Structure formats: C-alpha cells, structure tokens
Amino acid sequence: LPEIVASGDPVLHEKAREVDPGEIGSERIQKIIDDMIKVMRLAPCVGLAAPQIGVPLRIIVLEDTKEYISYAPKEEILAQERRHFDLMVMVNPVLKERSNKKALFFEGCESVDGFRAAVERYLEVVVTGYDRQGKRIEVNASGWQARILQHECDHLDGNLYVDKMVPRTFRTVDNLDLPLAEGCPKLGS
Amino acid sequence: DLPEIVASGDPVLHEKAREVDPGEIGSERIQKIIDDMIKVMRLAPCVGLAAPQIGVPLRIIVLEDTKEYISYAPKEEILAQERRHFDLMVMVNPVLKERSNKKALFFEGCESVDGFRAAVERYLEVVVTGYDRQGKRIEVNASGWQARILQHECDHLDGNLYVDKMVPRTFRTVDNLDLPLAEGCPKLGSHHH
Numbered sequence A: 001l002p003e004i005v006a007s008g009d010p011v012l013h014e015k016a017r018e019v020d021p022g023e024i025g026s027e028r029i030q031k032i033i034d035d036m037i038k039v040m041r042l043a044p045c046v047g048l049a050a051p052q053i054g055v056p057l058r059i060i061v062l063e064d065t066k067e068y069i070s071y072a073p074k075e076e077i078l079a080q081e082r083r084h085f086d087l088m089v090m091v092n093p094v095l096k097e098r099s100n101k102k103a104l105f106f107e108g109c110e111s112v113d114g115f116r117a118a119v120e121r122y123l124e125v126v127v128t129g130y131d132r133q134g135k136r137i138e139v140n141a142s143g144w145q146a147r148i149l150q151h152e153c154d155h156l157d158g159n160l161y162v163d164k165m166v167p168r169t170f171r172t173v174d175n176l177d178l179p180l181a182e183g184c185p186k187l188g189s
Numbered sequence B: 001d002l003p004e005i006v007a008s009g010d011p012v013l014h015e016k017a018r019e020v021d022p023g024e025i026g027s028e029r030i031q032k033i034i035d036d037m038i039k040v041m042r043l044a045p046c047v048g049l050a051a052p053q054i055g056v057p058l059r060i061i062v063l064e065d066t067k068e069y070i071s072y073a074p075k076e077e078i079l080a081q082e083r084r085h086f087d088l089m090v091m092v093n094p095v096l097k098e099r100s101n102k103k104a105l106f107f108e109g110c111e112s113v114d115g116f117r118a119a120v121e122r123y124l125e126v127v128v129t130g131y132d133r134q135g136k137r138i139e140v141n142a143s144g145w146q147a148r149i150l151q152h153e154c155d156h157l158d159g160n161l162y163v164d165k166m167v168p169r170t171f172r173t174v175d176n177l178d179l180p181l182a183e184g185c186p187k188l189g190s191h192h193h
C-alpha cells in the first residue's frame, strides 16, 4: 500500500488531471481506486483524494460509518449533522453548492498530522462525476458528508484546509477542546 | 520550575497581550519571566520567543541568533536571508514599524506549531521602540533575518501566528522543507535593495 503523502510534497499542491472516462474500468485505475479505499480504511479516515497517495488524478473516496461515528459524543454528531453514508468513489467530481447555507467546524487531514482548524463549508452540495465502474452519477449531500466532499474535491485542485481556515483557530489535536479566542466566530450554523 | 512552551489552541496565543507597567520592568517578578523566556528559547533551541508562548499574557519578546546556530545553515541560504548573528535582545512593550516597502519571502517555523514550516512575506527593514530588560527606553533598527524574527515575535503579542499569514500551498512538514515549491507559488528571496 502507498503511504499517505504529507504537506510539502508538490503532488498535494498541484492541480490533478482528469481521468479519461473510458479508462475508469481499466486495471490501472481500478488498482488506484482499490489502493485508495484500503489506505483510507487503514488510517482510518472518512475521505481521501488521489494526490494524497501521490497520484495526480481527479479521484476521491469517502465513507462514514456507524463505527466511526461511535467515537464522537451524540451532541457533537447532532450539531455536525454527521450521518453514516456508504462508500463513495467519484472520478472527475465537479462540486457546486445547493444553497448559501454554511457551517463552521473543526477539520483535520491525514496529510497534516497532529492539527485541526475551524473551516467554513457549504452545508448543501451537488457533485457530478463518474463512479468506480465509469457510470455517470450525481450526488446530493448535506451536513458532514457535504463537508467531506468539499475537503476531498479541494485536494484535486492542490488546495489544503490550512489555506482557508478561520484565523486564530489552528490548533494541536490535544488542544481541540480549548475555547475559541476572542473575536472568533462560533462553531455551528 | 521552567514553563513549557504553549502550543497552538491555547487562547493565550490567539489574544492580545497587555503592556507591562514600565515601572515594574525591573521587578524580580518580571525579571523571572524574562529569564524563563531566555532559558526556554535556548532549550528549544530557537531564535525568538514571546511571553504568551510561556503562558504569560504580557508584551515581552526575546531573541537571539548565535554564530553557532548560523554555522549549520547553507552559505547560500545565509546570504539570501541576510542572516547575521546578533546578541541576546529583550524588548518590553515593543512597537514595530517598517522602514520601507521592501519585502522578503522565506520559510518560518514557530515552537508553538511543532513540526511544520511555511513561507511568510515580511518587511526587510524595521524599527522597534520599547524598553530593554532594565526598563530603559530604546529603539532598535533591524534588517534581514533579525527584522523577520522581530516581526514574528511582535505578531505573537497581538495574538497572531504565521499560519494565518502564510503564502498558500507552502505549508509543509519539517522533513519536507526542501521539497520544490508547487507551480504558482512565488519564489523565495527578496526585493532588490
């Protein structure tokens, strides 16, 4: 299995290339997708983008499970509108917001080990693209799944969350629960 | 007992520190804070420290760049960064202002963000007014790397960290420091001067 690439590796900070839709069913692409799913599940994390394993292609994978959700308190899950969703593979995803509704919560990324920051995201999105088999799909998502989609689509354009985080919120994982500083907007929606 | 460096997340790093009463700078209490900062800075080791980084909500900075520290860096880097040794400096209630519009771009780290670096644009030339550790009124004129350190440390006193003013797509682990800059990133260096 490929290792998750850390911030600084140019592949993370460069625009990923579209996959030829007719090649999605190929050995080469299926292997990249298989590797991404295994890497994601090994971390474990709820989302991964191809550049994170050193592959400059427009591919994301994502899932949120009863198990992952069980590691957070009910009150946080409720606030974050965080709900299970089946494994999703999107090739050449194109994301657009469904409304102007936004929420602010702490995010992390496997390519930035040991830190989190508060990131404003759209609450409702639509993402078009291709599935694992090369069939055209349209995904409508809200709440936490929508945030995951934006985070992972961002990686395809060489964009990390640290370059669009709310000022004065960046923090170590151990400091996650400390108050927000004077003047910071409050978490939630 | 020597204080530990406070890490990003603790509100003392992210809020505005208060001035020291000038008449109190010479007191044992403030001297102790300053001695603690110096020991913590040298322990890391690093070239600058601000009081909020040891959990003290006061406007005090210390900084030091020794011939020894500088001996480790590449000759070409030292030249580009205009990085020259300077003796231990303490300023209380510093007030920083630029002396020209000339800027430079290089990588910075902060002990309060362990394990990462990013490229940050700074003024090449600054002047800082304030008090020394005995409470005497002073002015400090700096350029190159010393000017950068002054800006970074003064920023801490207003609850500002480099990560909120870094060039996009340059944030990186220390181990990846030397990897190439991605396309569209500005090159490291300085305006002609």
Ligand SMILES: [Zn+2]
Binding pocket: A108, A109, A110, A111, A151, A152, A155
């Ligand atoms: Zn990520």
Ligand SMILES: [Zn+2]
Binding pocket: B109, B110, B111, B112, B152, B153, B156
């Ligand atoms: Zn610092």
